[PDB]
Amino acid sequence: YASLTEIEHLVQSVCKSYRETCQLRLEDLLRQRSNIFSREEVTGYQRKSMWEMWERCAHHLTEAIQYVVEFAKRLSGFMELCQNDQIVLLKAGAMEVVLVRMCRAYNADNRTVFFEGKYGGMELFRALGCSELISSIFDFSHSLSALHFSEDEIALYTALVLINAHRPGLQEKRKVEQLQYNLELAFHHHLCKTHRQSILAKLPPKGKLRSLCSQHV
Ligand SMILES: CCn1c(CCC(=O)Nc2cccc3ccccc23)nnc1CCC1CCCCC1
C-alpha cells in the first residue's frame, strides 16, 4: 500500500528528475520563438546533403536519448529493476519519450520547430527527402501542443511511456507493474491537484507513439 505522502513524494521526484534532465529549458525555448531562420539560412540547410542532415539529426537524437536514459535512472524504482528490464523499457520507450519531449520545441503560432539555435518550419529538412515523416512529427507536435502540457504533465506522462509492463521480454513483469501502477497514481493524483483531469481523454493513443516511432525506425 502506498500512502498520500509516498504518492506526493513520487510526483515530486518525477517532476524534479525531468527538470534536471530536460536538456532544453522551457523558458529558453519560448524566449527563442522570436528568433527565426532567414531565407538564406533555410536555403543553406536545403542545400546540404541528405548525409549531413542525417548526421546532424542523428547527433541531436542520440543526445536526447542520453537525457532520457538519465531521466529513467533518477525515477525511484528504475535502478531497483534488473538490467534486462532496464534495457527492454529504454529500447522500447526512449524514442517515444523524445517525441513527446520534442513538442515543447514546436510553435503552433507559425508552425516552426527549434533546430540548432533558431526556429523554422518543415522546409528546413527538405534535403532528407522524408516529407511524410517530418509531416507526422509536425502534426503530432501540433496535436500535443494544443493541450499546453506543463513540465510536470510531461514528466509524469513521459514516465508512463517508459514504465510499461506490457513490453515483450521483461523478466520481473510484476516489479514493472507495481512501478507503473504507482506512476499512474502519481499522474492521476497530480492531475486532480492541478484541476487537469481533462487531458486524459486527449492524450494520443498508445499506438500513435509506437506506430510513428516505427516509421522513424
Ligand atoms: C532530438 C530532437 N531534435 C532537436 C532538438 C529540438 C527539438 O526537439 N526540435 C523539434 C521539435 C519538434 C519537431 C521537430 C522536427 C524536426 C526537427 C526538430 C524538431 N533538434 N533536432 C532534433 C532531431 C529530430 C529529428 C526527428 C527525426 C527526423 C529528423 C528530425
From Swiss-Prot:
Keywords: Activator, Biological rhythms, Developmental protein, Disease variant, DNA-binding, Metal-binding, Nucleus, Receptor, Transcription, Transcription regulation, Zinc, Zinc-finger. Changing residue 64 to F: Completely abolishes transcriptional activity. One of its GO terms (biological process) is negative regulation of transcription by RNA polymerase II. The keyword Metal-binding applies. It comes from the Eukaryota. GO terms for cellular component: chromatin; nuclear body; nucleoplasm; nucleus. GO terms for molecular function: DNA-binding transcription factor activity; DNA-binding transcription factor activity, RNA polymerase II-specific; DNA-binding transcription repressor activity, RNA polymerase II-specific; ligand-modulated transcription factor activity; nuclear receptor activity; oxysterol binding; RNA polymerase II cis-regulatory region sequence-specific DNA binding; sequence-specific double-stranded DNA binding. Residues 6-217 form the NR LBD domain. Isoform 1 is widely expressed in many tissues, including liver and adipose, and highly expressed in skeletal muscle. Isoform 2 is primarily expressed in immature thymocytes. Changing residue 134 to N: Nearly abolishes transcriptional activity. Induction: Up-regulated in the state of obesity. The keyword Coiled coil does not apply. It is linked to Immunodeficiency 42: An autosomal recessive primary immunodeficiency characterized by increased susceptibility to concomitant candidiasis and mycobacteriosis. Candidiasis is characterized by persistent and/or recurrent infections of the skin, nails and mucous membranes caused by organisms of the genus Candida. Mycobacteriosis is characterized by infections caused by moderately virulent mycobacterial species, such as Bacillus Calmette-Guerin (BCG) vaccine, environmental non-tuberculous mycobacteria, and by the more virulent Mycobacterium tuberculosis. The AF-2 (activation function-2) motif is required for recruiting coregulators containing LXXLL motifs such as NCOA1 and NCOA2. This is Nuclear receptor ROR-gamma. It comes from Homo sapiens. The gene is RORC.
